[PDB]
Amino acid sequence: ASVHGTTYELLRRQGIDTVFGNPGSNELPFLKDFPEDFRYILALQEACVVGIADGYAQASRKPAFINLHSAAGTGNAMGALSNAWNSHSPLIVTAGQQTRAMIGVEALLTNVDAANLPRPLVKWSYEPASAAEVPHAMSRAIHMASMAPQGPVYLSVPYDDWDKDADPQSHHLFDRHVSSSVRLNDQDLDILVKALNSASNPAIVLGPDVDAANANADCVMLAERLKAPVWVAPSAPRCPFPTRHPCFRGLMPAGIAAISQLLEGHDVVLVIGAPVFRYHQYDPGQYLKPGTRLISVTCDPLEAARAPMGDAIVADIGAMASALANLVEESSRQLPTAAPEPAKVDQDAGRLHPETVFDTLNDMAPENAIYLNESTSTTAQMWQRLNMRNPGSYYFCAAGGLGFALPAAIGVQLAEPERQVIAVIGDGSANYSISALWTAAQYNIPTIFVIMNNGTYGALRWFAGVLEAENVPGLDVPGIDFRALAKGYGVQALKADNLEQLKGSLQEALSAKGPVLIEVSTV
Amino acid sequence: ASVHGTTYELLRRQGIDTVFGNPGSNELPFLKDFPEDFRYILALQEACVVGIADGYAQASRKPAFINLHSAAGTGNAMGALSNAWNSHSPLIVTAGQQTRAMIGVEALLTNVDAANLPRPLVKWSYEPASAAEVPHAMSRAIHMASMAPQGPVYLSVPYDDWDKDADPQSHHLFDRHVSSSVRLNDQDLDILVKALNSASNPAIVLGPDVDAANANADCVMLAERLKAPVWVAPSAPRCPFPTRHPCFRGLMPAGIAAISQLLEGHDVVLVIGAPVFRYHQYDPGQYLKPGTRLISVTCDPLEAARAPMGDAIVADIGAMASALANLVEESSRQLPTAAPEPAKVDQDAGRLHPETVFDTLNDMAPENAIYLNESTSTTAQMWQRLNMRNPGSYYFCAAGGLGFALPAAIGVQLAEPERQVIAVIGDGSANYSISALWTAAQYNIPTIFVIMNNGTYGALRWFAGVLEAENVPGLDVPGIDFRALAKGYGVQALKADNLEQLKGSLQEALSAKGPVLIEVSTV
Amino acid sequence: ASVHGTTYELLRRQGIDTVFGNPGSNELPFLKDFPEDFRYILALQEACVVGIADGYAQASRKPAFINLHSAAGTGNAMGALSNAWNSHSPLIVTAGQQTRAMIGVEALLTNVDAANLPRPLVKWSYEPASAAEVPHAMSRAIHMASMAPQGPVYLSVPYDDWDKDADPQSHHLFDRHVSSSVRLNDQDLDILVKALNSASNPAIVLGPDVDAANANADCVMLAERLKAPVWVAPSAPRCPFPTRHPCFRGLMPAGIAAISQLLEGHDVVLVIGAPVFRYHQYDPGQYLKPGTRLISVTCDPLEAARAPMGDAIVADIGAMASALANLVEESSRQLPTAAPEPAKVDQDAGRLHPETVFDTLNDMAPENAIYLNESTSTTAQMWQRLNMRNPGSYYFCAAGGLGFALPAAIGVQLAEPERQVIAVIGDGSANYSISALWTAAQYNIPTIFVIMNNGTYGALRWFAGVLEAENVPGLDVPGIDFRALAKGYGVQALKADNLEQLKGSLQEALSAKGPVLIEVSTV
Ligand SMILES: COP(=O)(O)[C@@](O)(c1ccccc1)c1sc(CCOP(=O)(O)OP(=O)(O)O)c(C)[n+]1Cc1cnc(C)nc1N
Ligand SMILES: COP(=O)(O)[C@@](O)(c1ccccc1)c1sc(CCOP(=O)(O)OP(=O)(O)O)c(C)[n+]1Cc1cnc(C)nc1N
Ligand SMILES: COP(=O)(O)[C@@](O)(c1ccccc1)c1sc(CCOP(=O)(O)OP(=O)(O)O)c(C)[n+]1Cc1cnc(C)nc1N
Ligand SMILES: COP(=O)(O)[C@@](O)(c1ccccc1)c1sc(CCOP(=O)(O)OP(=O)(O)O)c(C)[n+]1Cc1cnc(C)nc1N
Ligand SMILES: [Cl-]
Ligand SMILES: [Cl-]
Ligand SMILES: [Cl-]
Ligand SMILES: [Cl-]
Ligand SMILES: [Cl-]
Ligand SMILES: [Cl-]
Ligand SMILES: [Cl-]
Numbered sequence A, B, C: 001a002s003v004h005g006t007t008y009e010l011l012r013r014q015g016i017d018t019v020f021g022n023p024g025s026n027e028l029p030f031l032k033d034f035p036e037d038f039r040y041i042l043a044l045q046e047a048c049v050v051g052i053a054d055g056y057a058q059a060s061r062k063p064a065f066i067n068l069h070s071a072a073g074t075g076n077a078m079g080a081l082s083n084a085w086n087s088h089s090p091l092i093v094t095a096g097q098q099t100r101a102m103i104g105v106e107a108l109l110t111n112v113d114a115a116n117l118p119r120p121l122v123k124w125s126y127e128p129a130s131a132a133e134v135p136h137a138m139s140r141a142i143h144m145a146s147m148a149p150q151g152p153v154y155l156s157v158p159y160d161d162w163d164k165d166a167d168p169q170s171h172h173l174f175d176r177h178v179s180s181s182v183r184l185n186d187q188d189l190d191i192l193v194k195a196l197n198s199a200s201n202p203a204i205v206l207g208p209d210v211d212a213a214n215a216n217a218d219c220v221m222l223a224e225r226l227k228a229p230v231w232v233a234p235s236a237p238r239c240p241f242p243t244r245h246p247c248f249r250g251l252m253p254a255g256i257a258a259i260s261q262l263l264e265g266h267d268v269v270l271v272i273g274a275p276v277f278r279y280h281q282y283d284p285g286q287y288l289k290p291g292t293r294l295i296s297v298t299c300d301p302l303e304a305a306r307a308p309m310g311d312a313i314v315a316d317i318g319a320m321a322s323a324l325a326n327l328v329e330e331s332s333r334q335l336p337t338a339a340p341e342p343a344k345v346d347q348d349a350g351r352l353h354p355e356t357v358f359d360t361l362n363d364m365a366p367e368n369a370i371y372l373n374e375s376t377s378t379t380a381q382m383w384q385r386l387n388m389r390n391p392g393s394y395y396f397c398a399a400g401g402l403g404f405a406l407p408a409a410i411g412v413q414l415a416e417p418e419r420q421v422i423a424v425i426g427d428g429s430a431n432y433s434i435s436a437l438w439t440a441a442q443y444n445i446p447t448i449f450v451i452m453n454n455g456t457y458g459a460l461r462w463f464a465g466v467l468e469a470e471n472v473p474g475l476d477v478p479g480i481d482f483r484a485l486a487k488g489y490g491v492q493a494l495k496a497d498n499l500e501q502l503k504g505s506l507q508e509a510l511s512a513k514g515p516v517l518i519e520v521s522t523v
């Protein structure tokens, strides 16, 4: 059989049925004769292609397959890959290379030194030494992306390889099963369980890999048994816990001193599925105060190595959460009391306070809604004001790279057709990957986009005021008409200049059969 | 406290008491005021430094710490690093850099682009952005080297850093424990156990990570329960099984077709602690024959991803071996019958056949001897003729890089003072790291070196003959006097030109209190 | 024709007729049927292979060709590559790779991520995408090594490529001529000349690229016209000026403040063929004093970019030196007076002072001898006491990496059979590449090796004393018998324990027909 035929049989046998892409000449011999059991999803720029695939992979909890054009396409997507690395997203990134005969002379569209291009943002990066090796290299890419800690991988394939004969022993690849569903040995697990059973004032901190594992319900059982307060680790890419459960204490601020203060007085802090810790602002102080010991369970050896404090165990988050939740004793301590509901801030008949926007969303959205956040000055308020009861309900750029939420919302909605997706995106952030709107229109993927228009890079003004940095250029973004941009890409465009208009426009968007953008005038 | 003082406290708290090194100006601020509870082991060239450390780490089953001089020192050791990568050896390699004030002008002894120098032969490679970061970077190095899959790491440190002030919060680093002692979840382990119990004709294949884990006894119990034959995987860097146990079937030849023929008729093949597979010669054919299913247990995701056939599980070898050995049923089939003794080859009163040398070592050496092999044309006969009953009894260059066994034998002997080390090394292989002899002399480490002098690169001549490659230059190495080389570096020098001389020289070497080299005249 | 045939034709047409190597299986298909118009020079370890080739290239002023074994062989040579980078040595380094069909499974002897292995120490590094590309890739390597600034390059070739068919269009590669023999345009060159003519007290500083270009005599003319003192730039790899010419002022100390003080009072300083500057010790101060302007002519953009002061011109050193020498006016100022003769140090009938050794060599050696220096505590005295009248008379490790001079002296002697080579090497330095001696014995290359045995790493003890660094381990190297090491590799061994013995052994060595090692007992 041909390399083309063998590779599509490997893909289907490993459960792949969708290709996310932006095409070019070096990819045509791969894409021709596209099989009837696969679908292709086009986007207009490569940051958007990768963002869409990333949201699909995160929500589906399975690998996503991507096809890009040589160095130009790969390079246009490297900001997107920065986020995917931080979220442990299982992305199989393929890129077409020039014919083997013209690589040496560096013809136009030759990807020079191709395996080095995406580094350091990938787990594995490779160009095969021969056409017959291509199916084996694809098998390696599928398993490197899928094994814990999951992450993006890169395969460059010369366009002349596809029509050649495959290795006849390639069939052994098709049904390979590789497992990393492992947990701590019985003896040492009993030691950890004893340490939790005897803690006087335990606390729990959960990160994005809990939600990726669907370990949310087991972490609820664990926190109930231990009667422990639960926080989400800073700069949170996902939501790992029901936000109105009595044990929940919210999003930790991303500062050294702020976190040591929250943890003071807790004798044992158990961190599950997070780096220790993803700080942001510089807030110098102690990493931990006297009398607190920390124990981290992580799927990633790089996270375990770099923590400046505590013990660590490297294992699968699903397997570990389930074991712990079923082994710990039921403590007779008092259950934590729920956090108070947020205050309703004053709102006049003019521009909307962000707080008003989140309270309105919470009143009106379905219980199984999925939110995405790229409104960078309003994140603390968002986490306080949205009740998220289910897994897979929140996504935020994992490496802080803007251009994620708009495309990712489209892929999430494709993966979860029965759950309404609502992306809350700032006016500055919207521009980075604006062309992704076209894919939602073309494939009728009914995502709702809420644009928070305050006229400025708000979060930057705030950091500057703090730093006392004066006379800084480039902080304001006046003169962008988001309803016209939505029209430009075929997406229905509504406005909200006051509270009554926000309520009406949201009612309509919830009832719509296609995607909808709402431009909100914010203070 | 200084960066110097903090760093030596981190090392001691993590169990390190020995520095393997070759010094220079950029390392003087690290090495000054050397602590009285540490020991420094000097070698005369950097391939020797790293080989010594590598044998010490493999035999001790714990990390080894190395200090080299900038780019020149690091570069001289990069062949050594190739072996260490393939053996999963936990090596912490440090190198001194120029003072930060002269890095930019590229003064003499500046390590340019330092973190890139040792790649791709290391798990992690780094240069800190400030002096106060040095202790944290050293903690990351220690844990990255020690976590499964174990391996070498690299840290570059500007010489002006050591006298600067350390951060008081570095104390949290000292007692961090990180575990990767994990096994497959109960539900999936029970499925595996059922498959082994149901097999009609199972076989087992063991690799070097069994011996690294001290899982040898558990594998013996597993084989006895399943009544299964046991092979060692090809290109073997270590010995994972007692070589005269009735189940033992020997070293697999390092060829695709050869291995599929051996495994014919076996319905389930369980591989533990090996790559699938480390082939050498090109022996094209089937990876497996029909009706053989393969299941691999490996500590290395890179091995699991690249296997061209079978299922895989990524976990700790010690943990998985113990669990399987204790859970499988006792089979009603008959135990394999032991391999017969090899035949004695005819030997006259002149130059020694390799077979005679191995039979003589087997008759005379202690039952707890430790052997090293770098006699490249005689490996199959070595494996047939030495009875190795105990763990930690054999080492061979894991990446096939010559210059390993001579220095490594010195490090193994330093780690295991109560077990006699005997290194069997070819005349060509002896020269790559010849200056290592000095270190055995200076520290009185009583390794025995058996030089197999056939006058040639024998393995190469054999390869050329198979390919019928004619008129190849550089295959012979006449005119080396190994007794004079030994005297040059202060090591006692004996000869063996016939069988009676060999028996006499071996008896003496076994009785000796210092290192001894024996130059053997072989056919 | 085959790739093998076409590649050897390209090599001979581009003037290459010697292969320096250490062989293995991945290289057998390249080395078989070795052509009658080529010669193979074998060395026992790869640091030695590359050092031999490096001395040969430097003395011959032409590229040298190297063949190594996969990653193990390449890695063993990377300290040698560090020096070659700093000396701008035109080295074409080839390494054999596994067959294409087993690269993906990572069989033994697979060079993983091969092109990244030697970085950052090479100008260009590559693995071809097909067998037919191999001749074009070799043509790229040859020209990249030879173009200004010259330097080392790396090519990895799968062993199955050689027997494959070459493209007939590869014939266009054979006679390609590439020139970088350029100089500054006439208008700007006239501006530079007027500045030199108008200077009241000019000085000149020369570096190794003057000697590589054979620009030495043009620099003498320039100095005589301008009536200018001449210094050699610090950490000098070569000698660019006659050491007893009246303008010569000697080797500059490798310190920032030392150099600005030497140049004080000179209104214009012209640097030719050196980095600005290769400092070593940290000697902080002014880069230049206020009344001094500096102008650098260099063949390397990396040198021009990193200079912390002065104007620069990037051009060919031969072409620029000739132009300047013939355009400048004859000044009416006084020619500098010659440095006085060094004083004779007191010497008893016991161990030799280094000064005595150099005075004796100067008295007895031919006027066209070639010296190599790896006696690291004696360099300043060597430069004062040896009259070197001719080009190509001195070599010193360009990156400070020990293990250069012993092999390089063999390659220089191979390149210049009618000039006596005398390598002055310390007892510590001798061990790094000791096995190189065998190549001098086997090919009867009559280098004289003078071992300076002071029992210690002397330069390190000096550096430690300056730092007041105490309790430093590893500074002494007792117990090495260099006459026995010489005998081990077949090289005649003489001793010199006092002045009368030194005079005798030198007279003998000068008369010898093979290589000779003299072990000198120094203070
Ligand atoms: C035959 O087309 P190719 O050789 O594939 C292409 O690479 C190309 C480049 C330069 C000149 C001609 C074609 C082209 S041309 C091309 C179509 C552009 O269409 P557009 O509507 O702009 O003009 P036209 O073709 O209708 O006149 C694409 C998508 N590509 C691939 C591509 C994808 N993504 C990125 C970032 N860069 C790329 N070059
Ligand atoms: C203080 O802000 P920072 O720490 O600089 C920023 O990096 C950031 C990231 C994540 C969370 C909060 C801030 C942010 S936030 C930010 C402004 C986004 O403005 P937007 O109008 O979307 O929301 P808001 O701030 O008004 O509520 C920018 C430009 N950046 C820098 C940036 C630039 N270009 C790209 C591709 N990614 C980036 N992150
Ligand atoms: C003050 O010495 P440094 O600045 O450390 C050194 O790098 C050096 C280099 C060039 C000139 C002067 C010193 C030197 S000089 C040196 C000692 C050589 O001793 P040797 O006995 O050869 O001569 P001497 O000093 O007694 O006259 C060493 C080990 N080093 C470090 C070093 C270690 N390993 C390797 C591969 N290369 C190296 N250069
Ligand atoms: C068929 O041999 P190959 O596949 O070429 C070789 O790589 C090898 C490795 C492991 C096992 C068997 C052979 C071998 S075996 C070998 C000869 C060693 O001769 P020695 O005299 O030590 O033993 P013998 O063969 O006579 O019994 C060489 C030079 N190589 C290549 C080589 C060169 N330089 C360095 C740094 N490392 C290397 N491995
Ligand atoms: Cl267990
Ligand atoms: Cl809707
Ligand atoms: Cl490298
Ligand atoms: Cl379990
Ligand atoms: Cl003994
Ligand atoms: Cl490569
Ligand atoms: Cl001109």
Ligand SMILES: [Cl-]
Pocket (backbone or CB within 6 Å): C420, C446, C509, C510, C511, C512, C513, C514
């Ligand atoms: Cl002579």
Ligand SMILES: [Mg+2]
Pocket (backbone or CB within 6 Å): A426, A427, A428, A452, A453, A454, A455, A456, A457, A458
């Ligand atoms: Mg804004």
Ligand SMILES: [Mg+2]
Pocket (backbone or CB within 6 Å): B426, B427, B428, B452, B453, B454, B455, B456, B457, B458
């Ligand atoms: Mg031999």
Ligand SMILES: [Mg+2]
Pocket (backbone or CB within 6 Å): C426, C427, C428, C452, C453, C454, C455, C456, C457, C458
């Ligand atoms: Mg010395």
